[PDB]
Design a binder for this molecule. Structure first.
Ligand SMILES: [Mg+2]
Ligand SMILES: [Mg+2]
Ligand SMILES: [Zn+2]
Ligand SMILES: [Zn+2]
Lengths: 49, 1362
RNA sequence: GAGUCU
């Protein structure tokens, strides 16, 4: 009865970069940071897989 | 070109014109259409020279046909265009302008010399007020300022009777009129009567200047410039951008402002304009000259177009982007490249993969040289095209040049010398550098995209220097610590680990093999596991008393895999070395053993073979990482629910108001931190001994072959700490503050963190990565400070003939001995003849190396402490002797003459600071302190031996300690210290001093999160200066009403009770004071800030009761970041905020008079009847109880020691040991290995200078601090020839000051403070004779150390002979 | 100014 509100989605504390990391829940924050940063550096290939 | 030294002085107006080759009288540059030098412009050809080589402007005289011809038409000398960067110019300023560096650079120089305030001088410069230059009748005083109104007074009354003027002219005439000889005498003779501190300091500095001003040949006139020199054009170039746009230096823009205002001033003087107009122009001239020289110093810097300020001359000299730090103590280099590095696990340790096309561009001149020799190319242009076409013949010749021609490989950051290593190049197919895995530790190079720089040693000397010094195979041990840096990691450790370790039966258990080769036969044949227990015949060679190896054959019970590894093992090592299951720590000992037994060659081949087999058997193993490999204990949810209930209990007691906020904070962290230990011990117990296997007998168990376990147990990568986060519990996370978050993460990475657990984890993630970016530079700045002080120091002499050294007791600290005597004393000349216990036969000679052999004999006889020759005690003036330093830790043998120790020392200290700032920061997620030291448990039986302890017995019947620095020893049967602890203040001892204890006994017990104040007398409690609201506060509860009192400090205190000290006074039943047994001290314990008190006024107490409880909140996890500032402060020799007081002279104490609480000590020694008096603060409870035989350097106030007080009272060896122990304790907390000798090196540089007390027989006389080396060279001739002996005192210096105190001003201006160094050197007329390394690095000469050592001393005999 | 190795 004391509850007033609730988080809308499971994803809301995270960014767009970090939302695309699978199993982010099991990654240390420190490596997750670089992963989302390097995901941005990923050159697109000849065949989009 | 070659020369002896460089000298600095002020430029005379006359001297400025000598450098000039014409006056620039116009601010014009170039004609916009016909782009040429303008008529007497800033880029004039008539003044600075022609734009093309040997070509006048008009073009009448071309080429060398006209050699030294000055064209009559345009007026231009037919010379090289080289002359345009070399010839300078000048500007005849119509009016004098002050030189900002001899005005603003404090001390003011012009003001310090005039004894006239800078404010007063500036008023004269900007024409606010007149200054009297020479008041004819002394009605008007000299150097007295007159306002514009006050000038008008004297003008009507006196007129010519006084000469007061205004502007730079007035300060220059003021500097002209002053006599240096007459004023200097007067200052000497009138210092006699007063003699204070700051008068005698400033009046003596004025004498030093006046005398040095005379001896320098400088005039005070020249502080003000009448002539302004111009920089040569090519040094401030107007060149064309490819497009039509041009570009120019910011100096051209500042020169133009100066010339415009100077030419206009000449015009307004020509026009005899009113003075109001003329003054504005003279202010603007001062502003433009001051902006030219140093832009941002006098006022707001003049900005150009970009909004940024114009870069001045001073700016191209001063600091980081100045010539010194960027284009002179460091350079861009020919025959260099780089690329992304990648493994070469096939390579040998002396090799590296160098790409084809890289090596082709690198070695171009050597190919053109071979192509002409073999007769393939006629000329170089022809050879260039052969190489550009990449002909088949060229690859063969390239291949020829590179054989036996080494290449240097470098990584950023270059923290220590091993950051550069030489290899033999191997040409490879791809574009990526291949690096040898074993040298990866020195570079700190991982292959996740590191890049490395390539350099070609061109000259033969450089080929030999590369191969003899900097080759990878010569550089195995660390110069910081005598241990190998070349040590297998990762796959290699895991592979030898998998090989050696055994397993129950397995395939083919208890078999019997002919040799190590039949073991490889059964494994490759597929009949035995590497883990089968087997008897094998192995023949070990062990080395005899002489050089010869003795062969011994024996049946050995080992696994198949262990037999196979013996094949790698060279002959000379026992088989005992490969009989255990090998981890990283053991494999490092194998190469260290092998290095000391066999030599360099065997180790290099052994190290390689270990690498090869380690990788290959790691690959065989197929070791892997699955989610099931991360075993969680079944009892995790059990541990957490118990530990949750314990923490809920303190928070429920907090809501009641029983336990406070700070108490709960420390108390809750202890419960969670022991719960993390509980889950982790459960995890490692259900992980390590989890394999329960059936043998051919029935059933037993062994260590688990869980893949992750093997990886952390072998030490290949990860540790038990990391496995907690994986399988166990993540633990307490750190706040970005450093203080620990009260809610820890219960979960692990296998189970997954939830939304909040992640959010909490990110606090610690960001703060770690933050220190990797920011705090690295405080650490790297230490490296730099350390290097600049030790730079110049080199091994000069073989043996100094000094008898002295530092006594090294073993670091036995905190139960387990932290550093043996053996480790601390190894590779060091025995100072004194140090024999065995029974003093009836010498064991070790005085001037002799400590080899591992002699160090083992020290343990046999149990040598306790050993006096050892140190760098600090060396009596070499020039540098250090080889003996005092000892063994080169990197080489394992006596240090060579010529080796640069200063730099090696700085680097070893600096590097681990710097690299550890990046290490457990990227890798750090969590916090892991465990500072809950409740109770000492003694482990061996012993007699209890306390020292520096004064306890008092309490009502309970317990020995309570009332001394701060109490130590607890553990004395064995014969009577020697095994274990050592710190027993703190207000601690309860189980057994007092001398009593026997058993092993595993709590010998001491106390409360960690509180520092009690305990009494020494019994009776009642009195409240003194404890007024409510001013000094203390109060808070109460309900029905009955329990109130606690909380003492406010100066932060939470009003101005009313500032000079009131709050203290709990002891009294008896009557109401009178209670004397502390055997002393005239009425009992009074001073309570400090934040001190919580539960006993209120009028409460009966016994001796040993706790009066007040001072909070002890320190929940920061101490990483490199929290301890490094301590290191910096120690090396910089800072007194703390509260230095502990020490006795200056040995003798009988008598306490004296008092100043409203503040104590005096009129101590009158037995021999020295003359007294020494010193004031003491009120609140300092003293350790000494007066009237007692106190010696030099006895702790009177408890508290931290100034290193200054240590050196002053207890000599050099005392202060050296304070610095080494205090600094080294900080690196020992982090597990960093730095030999004591490296700290000793820098401490020697700190103990460089010395103040001369008694008069000499030169010109030291009194107060003048000079270097130690110099005063001793005088004392050598004085002790023999005679005359007045010079009494002395050695002084301590911080790094940053000792670096600036060096006589080489080029060393000083290259370190920091460039603006100040140059001006103080210019005024003294100092001459730098280029002594140290910095100086010769600057001039681009051979280092006067290392390989050039030989060469520099050969020039020095040419100088002596005639 | 946006990055890469520490
Ligand atoms: Mg790494
Ligand atoms: Mg890397
Ligand atoms: Zn001409
Ligand atoms: Zn010496």
């Amino acid at each position: 009865d004391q509850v007033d509100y609730m988080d809308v989605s499971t994803q809301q504390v995270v960014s767009v970069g970090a939302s695309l990391i699978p199993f982010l829940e099991h990654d240390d924050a420190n490596r997750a940071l670089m992963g989302a940063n390097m995901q941005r550096q990923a050159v697109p290939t000849l065949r989009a897989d | 070109e070659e020369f002896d030294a460089i000298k600095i002085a002020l430029a005379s107006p006359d001297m400025i014109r000598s450098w000039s080759f014409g006056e620039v009288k116009k601010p014009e540059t170039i004609n916009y259409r016909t782009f040429k030098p303008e008529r007497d412009g800033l880029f004039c050809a008539r003044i600075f020279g022609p734009v093309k080589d040997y070509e006048c402007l008009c073009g009448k005289y071309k080429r060398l046909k006209h050699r030294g011809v000055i064209c009559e038409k345009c007026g231009v000398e037919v010379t090289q265009t080289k002359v345009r960067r070399e010839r300078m110019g000048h500007i005849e300023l119509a009016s004098p302008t002050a030189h900002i560096w001899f005005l603003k650079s404090l001390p003011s120089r012009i003001g310090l010399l005039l004894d006239m305030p800078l404010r007063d001088i500036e008023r004269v410069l900007y024409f606010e007020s007149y200054v009297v230059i020479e008041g004819g009748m002394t009605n008007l005083e000299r150097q007295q300022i007159l306002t514009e109104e006050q000038y008008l007074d004297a003008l009507e009354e006196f007129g010519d009777e006084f000469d007061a003027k205004m502007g730079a002219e007035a300060i220059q005439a003021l500097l002209k009129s002053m006599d240096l000889e007459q004023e200097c005498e007067q200052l000497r003779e009138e210092l006699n009567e007063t003699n204070s501190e700051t008068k005698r300091k400033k009046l003596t500095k004025r004498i030093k200047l006046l005398e040095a001003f005379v001896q320098s040949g400088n005039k005070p006139e020249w502080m003000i410039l009448t002539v302004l020199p111009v920089l040569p054009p090519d040094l401030r170039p107007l060149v064309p951008l490819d497009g039509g746009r041009f570009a120019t230096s910011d100096l051209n823009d500042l020169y133009r402002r100066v010339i415009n205002r100077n030419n206009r001033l000449k015009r307004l003087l020509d026009l005899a304009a009113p003075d109001i107009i003329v003054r504005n122009e003279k202010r603007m001239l001062q502003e433009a000259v001051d902006a030219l020289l140093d832009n941002g110093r006098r006022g707001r810097a003049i900005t150009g177009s970009n909004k940024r300020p114009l870069k001045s001359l001073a700016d191209m000299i001063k600091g980081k982007q100045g010539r010194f730090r960027q284009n002179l103590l460091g350079k861009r280099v020919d025959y260099s490249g780089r690329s992304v590095i990648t493994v070469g696990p096939y390579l040998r340790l002396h090799q590296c993969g160098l790409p084809k096309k890289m090596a082709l561009e690198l070695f171009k001149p050597f190919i053109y040289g071979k192509l002409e020799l073999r007769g393939l190319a006629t000329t170089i242009k022809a050879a260039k095209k052969m190489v550009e076409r990449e002909e088949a013949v060229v690859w063969d010749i390239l291949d020829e040049v590179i054989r036996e021609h080494p290449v240097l490989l470098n990584r950023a950051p270059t923290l220590h010398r091993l950051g550069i290593q030489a290899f033999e190049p191997v040409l490879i197919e791809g574009k990526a550098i291949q690096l040898h895995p074993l040298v990866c530790a020195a570079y700190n190079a991982d292959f996740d995209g590191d890049q490395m720089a390539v350099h070609v040693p061109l000259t033969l000397e450089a080929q030999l220097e590369a191969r003899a010094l900097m080759m990878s195979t010569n550089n195995i041990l660390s110069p910081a610590n005598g241990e190998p840096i070349i040590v297998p990691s990762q796959d290699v450790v895991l592979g030898l680990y998998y090989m050696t370790r055994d397993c129950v039966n397995a395939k083919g258990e208890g078999m019997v093999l002919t040799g190590p080769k039949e073991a490889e036969r059964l494994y490759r044949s597929g009949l035995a596991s590497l883990h089968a227990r087997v008897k094998v015949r192995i023949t070990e060679y062990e080395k005899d008393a002489n050089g010869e190896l003795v062969a011994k054959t024996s049946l050995k019970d080992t696994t198949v895999g262990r037999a196979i590894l013996w094949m790698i093992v060279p002959k000379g090592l026992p088989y005992s070395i490969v009989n255990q299951a090998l981890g990283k720590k053991a494999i490092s000992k194998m190469l260290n053993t092998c290095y000391r037994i066999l030599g360099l060659k065997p180790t290099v081949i052994f190290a390689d073979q270990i690498m090869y087999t380690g990788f290959a058997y790691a690959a065989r193993s197929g070791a892997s990482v699955g989610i099931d490999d991360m075993v969680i204990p079944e009892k995790k949810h059990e541990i957490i629910s118990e530990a949750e209930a314990e923490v809920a209990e303190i928070q429920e007691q907090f809501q009641s108001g029983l336990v406070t906020a700070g108490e709960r904070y420390n108390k809750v962290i202890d419960i969670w931190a022991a719960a993390n230990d509980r889950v982790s011990k459960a995890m490692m117990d259900n992980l390590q001994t989890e394999t329960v296997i059936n043998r051919d007998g029935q059933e037993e168990k062994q260590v688990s072959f869980n893949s992750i376990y093997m990886m952390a147990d072998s030490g290949a990568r990860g540790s038990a700490a990391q496995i907690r986060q994986l399988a166990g519990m993540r633990g307490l996370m750190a706040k970005p503050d450093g203080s620990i978050i009260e809610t820890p993460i219960t979960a692990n990475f296998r189970e997954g963190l939830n939304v909040l657990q992640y959010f909490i984890s990110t606090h610690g993630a960001r703060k770690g990565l933050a220190d990797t970016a920011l705090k690295t530079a405080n650490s790297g700045y230490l490296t730099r400070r350390l290097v600049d002080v030790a730079q110049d120091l080199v091994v000069t002499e073989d043996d100094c003939g000094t008898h002295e050294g530092i006594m090294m007791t073993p670091v036995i600290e905190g139960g387990d001995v932290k550093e043996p005597l053996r480790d601390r004393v190894l590779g060091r000349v025995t100072a004194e003849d140090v024999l065995k216990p029974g003093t009836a036969d010498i064991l070790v000679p005085r001037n002799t190396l400590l080899h591992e052999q002699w160090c083992d004999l020290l343990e046999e006889n149990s040598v306790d402490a050993v006096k050892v020759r140190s760098v600090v005690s060396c009596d070499t003036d020039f540098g250090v002797c080889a003996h005092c330093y000892g063994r080169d830790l990197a080489r394992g043998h006596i240090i060579n003459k010529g080796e640069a120790i200063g730099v090696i020392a700085a680097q070893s200290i600096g590097e681990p600071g710097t690299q550890l700032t990046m290490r457990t920061f990227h890798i750090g997620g969590a916090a892991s302190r465990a500072a809950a030291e409740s109770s000492i448990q003694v482990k061996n039986k012993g007699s209890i031996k306390l020292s520096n302890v004064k306890s008092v017995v309490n009502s309970s019947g317990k020995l309570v300690i009332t001394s701060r620095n109490t130590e607890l020893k553990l004395i064995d049967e014969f009577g020697r210290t095994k274990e050592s602890y710190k027993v703190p203040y207000g601690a309860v001892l189980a057994k007092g001093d001398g009593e026997q204890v058993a092993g595993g006994e709590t010998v001491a017990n106390w409360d960690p999160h509180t520092m009690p104040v305990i009494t020494e007398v019994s009776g009642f409690v009195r409240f003194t200066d404890m007024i409510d609201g001013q000094t203390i506060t109060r808070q109460t509860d309900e029905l009955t009403g329990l109130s606690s009192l909380v003492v406010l400090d100066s932060a939470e205190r009003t101005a009313g009770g500032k000079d009131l000290r709050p203290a709990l006074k002891i009294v008896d039943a009557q109401g009178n004071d209670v004397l502390i047994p055997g002393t005239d001290m009425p009992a009074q314990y001073f309570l400090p800030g934040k001190a919580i008190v539960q006993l209120e006024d009028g409460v009966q107490i016994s001796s040993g009761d706790t009066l007040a409880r001072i909070p002890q909140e320190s929940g920061g996890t101490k990483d490199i970041t929290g301890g490094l500032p301590r290191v910096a402060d120690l090396f910089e020799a800072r007194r703390p905020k509260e230095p502990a007081i020490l006795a200056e002279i040995s003798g009988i104490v008598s306490f004296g008079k008092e100043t409203k609480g503040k104590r005096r000590l009129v101590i009158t020694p037995v021999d020295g009847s003359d007294p020494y008096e010193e004031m003491i603060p009120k609140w300092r409870q003293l350790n000494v109880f007066e009237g007692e035989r106190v010696e030099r350097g006895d702790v009177i106030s408890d508290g931290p020691e100034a290193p200054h007080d240590i050196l002053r009272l207890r000599g050099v060896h005392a202060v050296t040991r304070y610095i080494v122990n205090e600094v080294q304790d900080v690196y020992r907390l982090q597990g960093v290995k730095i030999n004591d000798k490296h700290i000793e090196v820098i401490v020697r540089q700190m103990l460089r200078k010395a103040t001369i007390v008694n008069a000499g027989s030169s010109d030291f006389l009194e107060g003048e601090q000079v270097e130690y080396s110099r005063v001793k060279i005088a004392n050598r001739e004085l002790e023999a020839n005679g005359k007045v002996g010079a009494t002395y005192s050695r002084d301590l210096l911080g790094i940053t000051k000792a670096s600036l105190a060096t006589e080489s001003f080029i060393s000083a201006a290259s370190f920091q403070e460039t603006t100040r160094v140059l001006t103080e050197a210019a005024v003294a007329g100092k001459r730098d004779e280029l002594r140290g390394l910095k100086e010769n690095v600057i001039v681009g000469r051979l280092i006067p150390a290392g390989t050039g050592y030989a060469y520099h001393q050969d020039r020095m005999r040419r100088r002596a002979a005639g």
